[PDB]
């Protein structure tokens, strides 16, 4: 069985789809037309891929309306491949089998279904090979497209939709993919696909052609009788001319295109051809037949998302290793200039500069954290519609294994290198306080980065706003301007500065109990005014409270900022347009 | 006349072109084959577009070797359009006529030739309209490609080369462009072009087909005889099949492609088909016929390049206005925080911070200056090979009207806003010294930016290197670390820092003659040690000379850096690969 039907389809975004009828039988159903037509807009309506606000038709499966889980039981092959190149083919479709299937069955059955899919699709030669990223090379485009096709074949879908499987391919492998689809349909399985500029070498395989032009249906019926249909309408197909291009030239309406026939008789272009089809025998025959008629837990889908993210991170050691190396060299260099901090007139300047630069670098290093939910936006939307996971599990999985371990490490590397090469404060607690403050600053900057770019499609706009925001955050830090000299109507802006919160904690940790005047005991009293001989005087002059609360409130503020920004990012992901 | 011939062509980069022969007669000569074949590599050999090191053939025009100025007298239409979208069609080809022609003829003759070209080509409806950038919209693709065709038609070339005029177009305007080319060739003019996946609607227009596969010639002769040639070789063309795709399927070698003929008899794939052609009648007939056989001044091309660059800059008020607005906003904000600089203990910190931030911003704002010779690399290379200008005139024209006026303005805007809203030093000379120093810092940063990215094809690599270089330059400025406490083996690195040179001059200008202790006359003597009550003490503590030479040597160093970086950039442009 598995016969799809759609009656009186009307979609309004500007009505982009006028009255459309048709029955897709088990076979190889193709949708053709120009790019601006309803060719692509009808595939996403037949599958539950568009918002039902504008759909005014009636679509049925075996004469009954489609259930709620129709998207979970019907594969959809996205045009652009969204397979992760870092993992292998077997691991990619193993991840798919671990999510779309049920947890009642053991891993042996999931693996045997995986083996059956790769054997039927012909993926045994490159079963255990990497797909391939841009830096590293793997399988060719045909194998990647076949892997993407097999990704949704795991749950043995009854109906399979494809959005232009030929685009982005070459002439040699397009017929291979089409023959694979035809052989798959020979057992009997509805296959509905969009097609762009086909060849006659693949046109003969179609069993039901649907022609669309500017939202108007122009032909529907057997694909082998379309050429005769348009021949009997007064359009001759020249010899050695593609019938698909022959249809498209009529659809566009090129005068230099095919010539007319001879007329024996006894609305510029687009509404005459639709009107011709309306009063045709195919329309009456179609209308008579038309009128005759979660699964996985939260943890189970958190572990798998986190594992896939970790494998993606470790599979391409050029984004983690590059920043690790640059952090290591930056720490060694900074230790080189600031070697041997002295307790003299120049000690305060050096300490303030080295503590400010570390915080500024820790804040500016999180600008590149916008590649978390942007480079994976299309793939994420596809997983969410398909029925893989929910937003919370994806958000936590991409957080535990992508941001958590790649942000803690640079702070540790900076602190264990620059500390003893400088000689800040030889105490056990100060070292850990500095490490903790750097970790919090990095985490807060990364959380704000995720909050800003949580559903955007490009990075050229999030990064510029991020940089312009961090510049103002750096202005209100405490070194470039004295925070006690700000006007009352502008001093409040300092409370929205992450670098200020980190820098204040670092300074309060470093400057407590230090003398900066050789041979002058200012601890008892200061015989000279305008002296700043003692570290406490510098902290008070900078507006920093000397109590331990004046240290820990910085971390309290940083944690509050982390929570607010993470919640904002999760809400932005939750209310994303999923269609 | 104007008949092109090429005999025993052999090109070695791996020999990419084996023995190739052919005569291109006045007509519509097409080169066909797969992407990896010599389809594109032969067009750039027939025209003087490849390095003659590897060419081992013999190419002739009317039976004589081509002269040195062959590239100046033969149009070449680049595949991707390099027309400037900001200018209009009439202005674009007016710029072309003003450079590619001679200056003996008045402007009236150049203009009438311009009119004749736009009339012959049919560019009168959109003659005075803008081509169209990505933000603003103008003419459509077909007329843009036609404008690009007309750009090199100004000098009435005898031979015209085109690199895939159909690619990047649609099925409607491709036939229009091909018909335009055929109509142009009807008067008689050799037109040689590469073609990718044509249709039979345009195949009938060809007069000489040249089939290439992996550098081996597979057919050459009349285009209408190719289908019969391959039919007599044992390959049948199925009905309703494109002859071009019929040839390409044989060339690639698809088994699922067209079927074989019946054989009446009484080297895997590629060396048998070529060998068939070697001992064919077409080869003998071709071989018998084969064996039978600056202008403008420097100133005239400087003014036009500068005028075009200025028109491009003013055509899209989105790159200049954006930075102008952000500079105006930043100046007002900075004047807001730093309002009313006091002569107290916090005056030194505020002055140092505000003078450091301005220099750092002026340095970091020149990172976006790598879009000068990167986004226009292809256009520059094309116009240099074609013979529009020389490297010096292009370099100076893109310097006088693109970098000079867009870097001087932000310094003036910053200086006239933040100065009096702060109250740095109420003197006439200090204002101009600050403006001059900011201008020099911006110019030096921009010149180093140009020196780094002067021939690269992308910006993702130059910007990262420049950012990491400016971070180190900012480290050795004088505020984050005391320059007198550096180790002797690392102190020399400070001499390669533009921000340090600017900041030292600004500080020497601001801190000379200031007292920072209320009620303490430290000008006579300092009764208290560790006081830094006087501005001169701060300058000496920072390692800055107090002589006026200690101010002007900074500008001397900045000017020297400007000259060195500009020369390096010009040399990098001069030795670029122009093929």
């Amino acid at each position, epitope marked *: 069985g598995a016969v799809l039907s759609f009656h009186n389809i009307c979609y309004r975004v500007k009505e982009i789809l006028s009255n459309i009828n048709g029955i897709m039988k088990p076979g190889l159903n193709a949708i053709l037309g120009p790019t601006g037509g309803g060719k692509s807009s009808l595939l996403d309506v037949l599958a539950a891929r568009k918002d039902p606000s504008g759909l005014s038709g009636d679509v049925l499966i075996n004469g009954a309306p489609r259930p709620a889980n129709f998207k979970c039981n019907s594969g959809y092959v996205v045009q652009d491949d969204v397979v992760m190149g870092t993992l292998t083919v077997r691991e990619n479709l193993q991840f798919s089998a671990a999510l779309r299937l049920a947890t009642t069955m053991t891993n042996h059955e999931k693996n045997e279904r995986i083996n059956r899919v790769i054997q039927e699709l012909g993926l045994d030669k490159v079963a255990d090979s990497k797909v391939g990223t841009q830096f590293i090379r793997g399988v060719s485009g045909g194998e990647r497209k076949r892997t993407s096709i097999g990704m949704e074949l795991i749950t043995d879908p009854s109906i399979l939709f494809l959005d232009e499987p030929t685009t982005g391919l070459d002439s040699s492998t397009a017929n291979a993919v089409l023959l694979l689809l035809k052989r798959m349909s020979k057992q009997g399985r509805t296959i509905i696909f969009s097609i762009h500029q086909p060849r006659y070498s693949i046109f003969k395989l179609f069993d039901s052609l649907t022609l669309l032009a500017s939202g108007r249906l122009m032909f529907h019926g057997p694909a082998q009788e379309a050429l005769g249909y348009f021949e009997s309408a007064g359009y001759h197909c020249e010899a050695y001319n593609n019938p698909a291009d022959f249809f498209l030239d009529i659809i566009n309406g090129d005068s230099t295109a095919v010539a007319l026939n001879r007329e024996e008789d006894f609305k510029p272009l687009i509404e005459k051809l639709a009107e011709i089809y309306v009063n045709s025998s195919f329309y009456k025959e179609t209308k008579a037949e038309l009128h005759q008629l979660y699964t996985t837990s939260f943890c189970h889908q958190l572990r798998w998302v986190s594992k896939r993210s970790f494998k993606n991170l470790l599979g391409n050691p050029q984004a983690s290793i590059a920043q690790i190396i640059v952090t290591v060299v930056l720490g060694l260099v900074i230790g080189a200039i600031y070697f041997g901090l002295k307790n003299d007139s120049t000690g305060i300047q050096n300490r303030a500069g080295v503590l400010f630069f570390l915080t500024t670098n820790q804040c500016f290093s999180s600008v590149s954290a916008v590649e978390l939910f942007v480079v994976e936006k299309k793939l994420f939307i596809h997983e969410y519609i398909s029925g893989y996971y929910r937003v919370s599990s994806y958000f936590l999985g991409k957080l535990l294994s992508d941001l958590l371990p790649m942000r803690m490490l640079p702070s540790i590397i900076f602190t264990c290198i620059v500390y003893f090469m400088l000689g800040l404060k030889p105490k056990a607690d100060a070292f850990f306080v500095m490490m903790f403050t750097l970790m919090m600053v990095a985490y807060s900057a990364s959380s704000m980065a995720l909050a800003i770019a949580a559903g955007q499609s490009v990075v050229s706009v999030a990064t510029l706003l991020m940089t312009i925001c961090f510049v103002f955050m750096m202005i209100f830090s405490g070194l470039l301007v004295n925070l006690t000299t700000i006007a009352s109507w502008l001093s409040w802006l300092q409370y929205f500065s992450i670098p200020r919160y980190g820098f204040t904690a670092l300074q309060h940790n470093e400057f407590l109990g230090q003398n900066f005047c050789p041979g002058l005991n200012a601890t*008892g*009293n*200061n015989p*000279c*005014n305008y002296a700043t001989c003692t570290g406490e005087e510098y902290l008070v002059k900078q507006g920093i409270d*000397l109590s331990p609360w004046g240290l820990w409130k910085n971390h309290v503020a940083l944690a509050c900022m982390i929570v607010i920004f993470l919640t904002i990012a999760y809400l932005k992901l939750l209310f994303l347009k999923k269609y | 006349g104007a008949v092109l011939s090429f005999h025993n062509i052999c090109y070695r980069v791996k020999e990419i072109l084996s023995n190739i022969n052919g005569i291109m007669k006045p007509g519509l000569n097409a080169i066909l084959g797969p992407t990896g074949g010599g389809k594109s590599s032969l067009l750039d050999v027939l025209a003087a577009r490849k390095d003659p090191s590897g060419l081992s053939g013999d190419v002739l025009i009317n039976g004589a070797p081509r002269p040195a100025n062959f590239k100046c007298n033969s149009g070449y239409v680049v595949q991707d359009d390099v027309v400037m979208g900001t200018l209009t069609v009439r202005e674009n080809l007016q710029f072309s006529a003003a450079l590619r022609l001679a200056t003996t003829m008045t402007n009236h003759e150049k203009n009438e030739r311009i009119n004749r070209v736009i009339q012959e080509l049919g560019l009168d409806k959109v003659a005075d309209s803008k081509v169209g950038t990505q933000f603003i919209r103008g003419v459509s693709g077909g007329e843009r490609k036609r404008t690009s065709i007309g750009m090199e038609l100004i000098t009435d070339p005898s031979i015209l080369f085109l690199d895939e005029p159909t690619t990047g177009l649609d099925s409607s305007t491709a036939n229009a462009v091909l018909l335009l080319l055929k109509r142009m060739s009807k008067q008689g003019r050799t037109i040689i072009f590469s073609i990718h996946q044509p249709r039979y609607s345009i195949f009938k227009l060809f007069d000489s087909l040249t089939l290439l596969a992996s550098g081996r010639l597979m057919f050459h002769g009349p285009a209408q005889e190719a289908l019969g040639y391959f039919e007599s070789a044992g390959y049948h063309c199925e009905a309703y099949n494109n002859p071009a795709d019929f040839f390409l399927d044989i060339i690639n070698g698809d088994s699922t492609a067209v079927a074989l003929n019946r054989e009446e008899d009484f080297k895997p794939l590629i060396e048998k088909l070529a060998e068939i052609y070697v001992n064919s009648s077409f080869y003998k007939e071709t071989k018998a016929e084969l064996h039978q056989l600056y202008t403008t001044s420097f100133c005239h091309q400087l003014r036009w390049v500068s005028k075009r660059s200025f028109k491009n800059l003013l055509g899209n008020p989105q790159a200049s206005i954006a930075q102008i607005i952000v500079t105006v906003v930043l100046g007002l904000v900075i004047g807001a925080i730093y309002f009313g600089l006091k002569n107290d203990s916090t005056g030194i910190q505020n002055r140092a911070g505000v003078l450091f931030f301005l220099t750092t911003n002026q340095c970091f704002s020149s990172v976006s200056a790598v879009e000068l010779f990167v986004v226009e690399k292809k256009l520059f290379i094309h116009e240099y090979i074609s013979g529009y200008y020389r490297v010096s005139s292009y370099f100076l024209g893109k310097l006088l009207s693109d970098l000079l006026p867009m870097r001087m303005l932000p310094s003036i805007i910053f200086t006239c806003i933040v100065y009096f809203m702060l109250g740095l030093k109420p003197k006439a000379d200090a204002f101009f010294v600050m403006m001059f120093t900011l201008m020099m810092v911006a110019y030096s940063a921009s010149s180093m930016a140009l020196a780094i990215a002067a021939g690269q094809s992308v910006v993702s690599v130059a910007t990262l290197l420049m950012t990491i270089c400016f971070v180190f330059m900012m480290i050795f400025s004088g505020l984050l670390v005391n320059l007198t406490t550096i180790a002797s083996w690392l102190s020399w690195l400070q001499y390669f820092s533009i921000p340090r040179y600017g900041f030292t001059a600004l500080q020497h200008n601001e801190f000379l003659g200031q007292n920072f202790c*209320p*009620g*303490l006359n430290a000008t006579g003597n300092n*009764p208290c040690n560790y006081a830094t009550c006087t501005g001169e003490e701060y300058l000496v503590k920072q390692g800055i000379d107090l002589s006026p030479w200690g101010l002007w040597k900074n500008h001397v160093a900045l000017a020297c850096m400007i000259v060195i970086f500009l020369t390096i950039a010009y040399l990098k442009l001069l030795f670029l690969k122009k093929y």
Partner: antibody
Amino acid sequence: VQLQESGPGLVKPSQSLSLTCTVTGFSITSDYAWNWIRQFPGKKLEWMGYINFDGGTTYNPSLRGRISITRDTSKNQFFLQLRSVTPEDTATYYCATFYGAKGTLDYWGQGTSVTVSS
Amino acid sequence: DIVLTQSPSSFSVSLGDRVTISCKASGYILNRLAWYQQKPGNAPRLLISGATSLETGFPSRFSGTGSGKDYTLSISSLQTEDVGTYYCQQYWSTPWTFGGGTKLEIR
């Protein structure tokens, strides 16, 4: 070293008040800062503002644009102008000196009781 | 600003006793507090500078201690020429604020 106060003692309300402190024994442009302290009709003290030895003047935020201190080198004095006087501004005004290197007010003046009445 | 407060507005002590005048601060003064003594009908003479030291012309009966936000002035063996009003003034920030008032009154 020695300071002397001078000025009126009866200023009409909503008017301008002008006082003068004469310095003898030291130069007003040499080293110190010169202040004005008013003691209210009670036992409170308030620092109004001071002038440096070069001409820099710093005022109290409480007197929003009501106080202006101007010095004359020839007679070695500094004068105080307080505009828009009010009935409740009935303090006695001392002119003290500020060392700076020590931070405390060493020498003072006799003071004058200023009455604001109709 | 920095508000200087003096908890005892008025004292009732006798001759030859230990008088303790304590005054706290809103912010951190950092040993920049000075004590002043005013007679009933004279200028306020300066007693202690630096909150610990002591100026010439005064006996050693006066002592100044304290660090952080609060400072104390101690008078040992109070005699009859030590009455008046005592003030503590900070000179950390520019708006110099004096204390309250401690007018001694013997019985």
